[PDB]
């Protein structure tokens, strides 16, 4: 039916009314257009918002995000999925369990057929680096993810930017077709074309937070020629209009039709208006999405896999056949110090995984696709849990037998699990520092600095026993001490390193370091079997604390957006 | 007087003629506009260029770059200089030694006064992060660096992009003022405004390498309405023109006025046309520019200075008072392995210095401001030579006495100079890999991978003696073996490490490592005094070879551009 929208003097000193149809907002950049669209989006409640908001008479803060439609400037779709897997995803995540798969796919066919994308509906729509689909059709899919709920009101932020001539106008033809479907749509257009400007039925303007003329395009020309400076002479009078409308110019030139009977006419119209699944199915489904996205992207996966394979081979070649001579100790303690520390900076790529999809995270949370614990535990299942398993098991299996470490099977398991835990914990710190930022680089430098300051406090490079006591306490903040201490706990402990010297109750060699025990105690490591596993409890404790910090960052920044 | 420009059928199948005045080129992106401007720029001679080029009758390849004027899309000015230091720089580098400083500054005053920038002429025009000057005035200075030689022909690439409404039009007013000064100007405008489109006297078009209509704007409307699809109805007929002009459409719609008497008219006009300082002053002057640019930028300088100071303090605190106990060796050999390797990755920032100014390098070489050896030896004097001196001398002076290394003054000098050389050599490798690329990141990852593969072949982490012989040869490709080997040559050599054990002719401790000699030989380092300095000859040899590789990359990519 008729969908109307009302705003009484909201904040500054701006009134609003929307008929069932099509409408855009327009103005110079920094004119508050996207911030007015933040107000229209109902994304930030503690912001100063002083005025009355009526959505068909109903108040604003109650359940507005569920049925409204909102699309950001960016059109962020998963970089490897297709159209159909996208709309099956957001279809099966927005709509309830009651809708069957055939009725869901029927909605999918009416939405894709409504947009005319069936030819591309099995083409991989994520086009960052593979470039299978034109960007305007990707914009159509991004809008279609809001078409899934069949909304009444749609908000689009900058659809004209980032496209060429004809495709953006064709998108505007499909959006005019959606206006024909009985919906209200609101744009925020940077700099349009005069043809679709003629196609507009209404348009408002913004001047740095100041309300300018709302009304039709031909009546923007009419009520603007009433304000003087008549637009003629083929000067693109939408853009020439835009060039005359931009402080006594703004306040006075708006004020002279504050006095007008059109503003009092719609003010009298304003006075006339005064009289999902719980936990498991969503993390399985989102984890299915990003898990397929990792399977869909061979670049970041298989690049890291071939790096850790060939690097595992090179460490296998250099250290091949570790002898038990005098040169055994600093060679065995060499490679362990590499691997742990390798895992630590191999976690720096895990800074990327929460920062790239951040706009998709905040857009998908303001719409409410998921619960945050379901998101976080889901995405952690998707990327971190399998991809941190692979270089651990690959490293242990290809370097453990070239090097000739301990032939016992359980020691191979402790090395396996140890590289697993130190990978998850360094990656957990990378998430704990990384989550909630927009820039990868500053967090990357900050993580690199904290990993070198944890590198020094491993056992190799300082002898942790002889630090002075007023800063020897901060050993415990170092993750490769836990990794390196475990990996040289399970691997030195039976060994022996001076040929011909038994060195049990060693006599006139003192100072000799002719066991693995003497290297461990001289290094300062609890030779008791609990001293091996307290490294792992310290590890898992750092996993839980660091992921809790990232979790609290997500709950505290989820509404900031 | 009258400056004319002629092109007979150059390549594809494109003819050219320019009157004394103002002209732009226009078309869809990827239409070959900037490549046609590469042809007009005379930057790539081995490219396929088949046709006749006449500049007032004179041929093209002889000395065209000296008197022509060319500005790239970007307006790259030094990020910290002001307008006056910029134009004093390019004034004193383009013009000869014969021009006195007062006449040079008089030209500066007529050019700045010609552009109307005297109010900003002492404001810091480099506005990447400090943002002192509007970008349009920075564009005016970038054009003024071509106004220094007082050219006849000026080429401007995309002046309208990257600016707001009024400032770009005001720039076009100053450029129309330059057309009033009796010069020919050629633009390449992405998407203009109809007002300055009315201000054009002539305009050509490009369709993916195909020559479209050249002529006046009102005659673009006239000869285009002769081609059908008449432009009316306020549709921005420059942009609506642009929307109708974009394969039988291109070839046929251009071909129907290939037949026209205007194209045969200008073809009959074409048939009518058929009938510095040596070495020292320039490197002192450019080295003055970038040296002031480093003094002008406290961010990259003082950030690295406070990092190496506080990092020097922390290494001073952790290792404070190195004891000569059993734990001495792995502690002294710890910190040395840090510092060298620190310097190596502290060279990764030196990847940045030739890649950021790359567009300014190629633009400043196609104009011919300098000689390449003068550029390279100048820029190496500017950034690399002082900034690599500071963390070496700061590290040695603040960690050398906290740690309590050898009290001799010459050993302090060898450590000082050694950290200097390993900093210059790792930085030299960073230049040798870095120079000639546009992306910092891939070279950054590639440098990080080669620095870890040189990290393993230092003395600490493998015991270089017991590598198998078929890949022990590649020790010599590692830079921290040279640094670390020198720093532990001058610092272990007198020492002693087992308290109460004299260990000269050591008896029933064998295996003991109770000198600094036994650690050196057991590490595999020439205990003779030449074995200290051959590290430095290997260093300086790597400096000369790596900088030679970067030098050859600059001579081989200088004309690629």
């Amino acid at each position, epitope marked *: 039916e008729g969908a109307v929208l009302s705003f009484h003097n909201i904040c500054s000193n701006i009134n609003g009314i929307m008929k069932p149809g099509l409408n855009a907002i327009l103005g110079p950049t920094g004119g508050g257009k996207s911030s007015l669209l933040d107000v229209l989006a109902a994304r930030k409640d503690p912001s100063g918002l002083s005025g009355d908001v009526l959505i068909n008479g109903a108040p604003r803060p109650a359940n507005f995000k569920c049925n409204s439609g909102y699309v950001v400037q960016d059109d962020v779709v998963m970089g490897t999925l297709t159209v159909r897997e996208n709309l099956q995803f957001s279809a099966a995540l927005r709509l309830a369990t009651t809708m069957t798969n055939h009725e869901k796919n029927e909605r999918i066919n009416r939405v894709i057929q409504e947009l005319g994308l069936d030819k591309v509906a099995d083409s991989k729509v994520g086009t960052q680096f593979i470039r299978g689909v034109s960007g305007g059709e990707r914009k159509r899919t991004s809008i279609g993810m809001e078409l899934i709920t069949d909304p009444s009101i749609l908000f689009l932020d900058e659809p004209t930017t980032g496209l060429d001539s004809s495709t953006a106008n064709a998108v505007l033809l499909l959006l005019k077709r959606m206006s024909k479907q009985g919906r209200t749509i609101i744009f925020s257009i940077h700099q349009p074309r005069y043809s679709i400007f003629k196609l507009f039925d209404s348009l408002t303007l913004l001047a740095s937070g100041r309300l300018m003329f709302h009304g039709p395009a031909q009546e923007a020309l009419g009520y603007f020629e009433s304000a003087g400076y008549h637009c003629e002479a083929y000067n693109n009078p939408a853009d020439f209009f835009l060039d005359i409308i931009n402080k006594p110019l703004i306040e006075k030139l708006a004020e002279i039709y504050v006095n007008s009977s059109f503003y009092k006419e719609t003010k009298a119209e304003l006075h006339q208006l005064s009289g999902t699944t719980s936990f498991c199915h969503q993390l399985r489904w989102v984890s299915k999405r990003s898990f397929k996205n990792l399977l869909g992207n061979p670049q970041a996966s298989i690049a890291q896999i071939i790096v850790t394979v060939v690097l595992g081979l090179v460490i296998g070649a250099i250290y091949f056949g570790l002898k038990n001579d005098s040169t055994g100790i600093q060679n065995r303690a060499g490679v362990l110090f590499f691997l742990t520390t390798n895992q630590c900076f191999s976690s720096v790529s895990a800074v990327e995984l929460f920062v790239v999809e951040k706009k998709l995270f905040i857009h998908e949370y303001i719409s409410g696709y998921y619960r945050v614990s379901s998101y976080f535990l889901g995405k952690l299942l998707s990327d971190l849990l399998p991809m941190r398993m692979l270089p651990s098991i690959i490293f242990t299996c290809i370097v453990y037998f070239m090097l000739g470490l301990k032939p016992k099977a359980d020691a191979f398991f402790v090395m396996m699990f140890t590289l697993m835990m130190v990978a998850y914990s360094a990656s957990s710190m990378a998430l704990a520092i990384a989550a909630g930022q927009s820039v990868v680089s500053v967090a990357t430098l900050l993580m690199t600095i904290c990993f070198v300051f944890m590198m020094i406090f491993s056992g190799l490079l300082v002898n942790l*026993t002889t630090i002075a006591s007023w800063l020897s306490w901060l050993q415990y903040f170092s993750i490769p001490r836990y990794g390196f201490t475990a990996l040289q706990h399970n691997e030195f402990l039976g060994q022996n390193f001076c040929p011909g010297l038994n060195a*049990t*109750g*060693n*006599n*006139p*060699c*003192n*100072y000799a370091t002719c066991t693995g*025990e*003497e290297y461990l*105690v001289k290094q300062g490591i609890d*030779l008791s079997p609990w001293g091996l596993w307290k490294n792992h409890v310290a590890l898992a404790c750092m996993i839980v604390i660091f992921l809790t910090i990232a979790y609290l960052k997500l709950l505290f920044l989820k509404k900031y957006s | 007087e009258g400056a004319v420009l002629s092109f007979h059928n150059i390549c594809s199948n494109i003819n050219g003629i320019m009157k004394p005045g103002l002209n732009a080129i226009l078309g869809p992106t990827g239409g070959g506009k900037s490549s046609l401007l590469d042809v007009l720029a005379a930057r790539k001679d081995p490219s396929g260029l088949s046709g006749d080029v006449l500049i007032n009758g004179a041929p093209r390849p002889a000395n065209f770059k000296c008197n022509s004027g060319y500005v790239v899309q970007d307006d790259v000015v030094m990020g910290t200089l002001t307008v006056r230091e910029n134009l004093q720089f390019s004034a004193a580098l383009r013009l000869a030694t014969t021009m006195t400083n007062h006449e040079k500054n008089e030209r500066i005053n007529r050019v700045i006064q010609e552009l109307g920038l005297d109010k900003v002429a002492d404001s810091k025009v480099g506005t990447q992060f400090i943002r002192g000057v509007s970008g349009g005035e920075r564009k005016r200075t970038s054009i003024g660096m071509e106004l220094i030689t007082d050219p006849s022909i000026l080429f401007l690439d995309e002046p309208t992009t990257g600016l707001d409404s009024s400032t770009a039009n005001a720039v076009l007013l100053l450029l129309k003022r330059m057309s009033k000064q009796g010069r020919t100007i050629i633009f390449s405008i992405h998407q203009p405004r109809y007002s300055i489109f009315k201000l054009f006297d002539s305009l050509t078009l490009l369709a993916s390498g195909r020559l479209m209509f050249h002529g006046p704007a009102q005659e673009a409307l006239g000869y285009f309405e002769s081609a059908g699809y008449h432009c009316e109805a306020y549709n921005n007929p420059a942009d609506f023109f642009l929307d109708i002009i974009n394969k039988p459409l291109i070839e046929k719609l251009a071909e129907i006025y290939v037949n026209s008497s205007f194209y045969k008219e200008t073809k009959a006009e074409l048939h009518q046309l058929s009938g510095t300082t040596s070495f020292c002053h320039q490197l002192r002057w450019v080295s003055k520019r970038s040296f002031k640019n480093l003094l002008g930028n406290p961010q990259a300088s003082i950030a690295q200075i406070i990092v190496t100071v506080v990092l020097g303090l922390v290494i001073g605190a952790i290792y404070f008072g190195l*004891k*000569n*106990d059993s734990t001495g060796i792995q502690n002294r050999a710890g910190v040395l392995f840090f510092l060298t390797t620190n310097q190596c990755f502290s060279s990764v920032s030196a990847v940045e210095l030739f890649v950021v100014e790359k567009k300014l390098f190629i633009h400043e070489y196609i104009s011919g401001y300098y000689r390449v050896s003068s550029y390279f030896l100048g820029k190496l004097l500017s950034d690399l030579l002082p900034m690599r001196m500071l963390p070496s001398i700061i590290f040695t002076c603040i960690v050398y006495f906290m740690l309590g290394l050898k009290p001799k003054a010459d050993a302090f000098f060898v450590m000082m100079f050694t950290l200097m050389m390993v900093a210059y050599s790792a930085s030299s490798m960073a230049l040798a890999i870095a120079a000639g690329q546009s992306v910092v990141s891939v070279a950054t990852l590639l440098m990080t991978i080669c620095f870890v593969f040189m990290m393993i072949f230092s003395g600490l982490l493998v015991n270089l003696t017991t590598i198998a012989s078929w890949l022990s040869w590649l020790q010599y490709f590692s830079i921290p073996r040279y640094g670390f080997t020198a720093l532990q040559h001058n610092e272990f050599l007198g020492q*002693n490490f*087992c*308290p*109460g*054990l*004299n260990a000269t002719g050591n008896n*029933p*401790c064998n295996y*003991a490592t109770c000198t600094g000699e036994e650690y050196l030989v057991k590490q595999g380092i020439d205990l003779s005094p030449w074995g200290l300095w051959k590290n430095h000859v290997a260093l300086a040899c790597m400096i000369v070879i790596f900088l030679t590789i970067a030098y050859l990359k600059l001579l081989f990519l200088k004309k690629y551009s």
Partner: antibody
Amino acid sequence: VQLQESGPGLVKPSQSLSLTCTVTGFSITSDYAWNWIRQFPGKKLEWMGYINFDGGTTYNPSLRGRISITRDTSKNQFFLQLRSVTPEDTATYYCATFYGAKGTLDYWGQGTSVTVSS
Amino acid sequence: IVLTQSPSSFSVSLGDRVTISCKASGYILNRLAWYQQKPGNAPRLLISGATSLETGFPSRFSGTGSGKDYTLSISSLQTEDVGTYYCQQYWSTPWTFGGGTKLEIRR
């Protein structure tokens, strides 16, 4: 090796005391590390500190700033001075000779009681 | 590292086997010497390396134990072997001794 230390049998509190352990048999700069060990009245022992053959010193970190051990190479002597004494430091004192590669304090001085008293 | 030599007294008759157990606070890894202080003398070295024995002793003395437990064991406790026995780690400076054990003769 034959060690013999000799000095005062008393010092006033908040002063310094000096002892000297004349060594016959080796040179102080030849082989071993050379050591001072107190013993509280009754039973308890406390290693104080060694200067080794190359003049570097190591002191028991309980006795920070208060002990200093010096070396006189020509007479084969090594000295302690203990600054800011206390009647706690009334103790039997010993010079003792540390092998290094055996690790154990092999030879000991015969001993002199030192009584801090007012 | 503090040693802990418990107990500090025994009263065992002549010609017997007696056992002294020095307990470290960390691992000291056979770096544990036993010293044998008489009444009125300096501590003479008895057991070096926690197993061996300095020459010039009746070889009735036997140092055993590893890990953290160490033990001097005297078979046929003679008259000369009453005294005070101080265990002493030398794994790391400072070289804390033990509290000592004053043996006694049964009456």
